[PDB]
Amino acid sequence: EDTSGVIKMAVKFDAAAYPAQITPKMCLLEWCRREKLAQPVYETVQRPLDRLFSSIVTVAEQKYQSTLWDKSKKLAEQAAAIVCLRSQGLPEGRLG
Ligand SMILES: C[As](C)(=O)[O-]
Numbered sequence: 001e002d003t004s005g006v007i008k009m010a011v012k013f014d015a016a017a018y019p020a021q022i023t024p025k026m027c028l029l030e031w032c033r034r035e036k037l038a039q040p041v042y043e044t045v046q047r048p049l050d051r052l053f054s055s056i057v058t059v060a061e062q063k064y065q066s067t068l069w070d071k072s073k074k075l076a077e078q079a080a081a082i083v084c085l086r087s088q089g090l091p092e093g094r095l096g
C-alpha cells in the first residue's frame with residue numbers, strides 16, 4: 001500500500017552474530033532473488049566532519065535506513081540491510 005518515505009530501526013551490524021560467510025546484505029539479496037524483486041539499491045549518506053556513514057536501501061520501492069551512524073560505507077550498508085529484513089519480520093541470517 002504505502003511505500004513512501006523511510007522505515008527506520010536502531011541497528012548496528014555485529015559480525016560476531018553471523019556465520020563466517022553470510023551477511024545481512026547477502027540475506028537481503030537472496031530474499032529479493034527468491035521473491036523475484038529488483039536487487040537492493042544502496043545509497044551512501046555521509047557526515048564527513050565526523051567521519052560518519054549511513055546508507056539508505058531501496059527494496060520493492062521502499063526506503064530503509066538505520067537511525068544510527070557507522071564508521072564505514074560497508075558497515076552502514078549491513079545496518080541498512082538489517083533494517084530492511086528486521087522491519088519486515090524476515091530471517092536475517094544470524095546464528096541464534
Ligand atoms: C552507492 As554510493 C555511489 O551512494 O556510495
Ligand SMILES: [Cl-]
Nearest residue numbers: 091092093094
Ligand atoms: Cl535471523
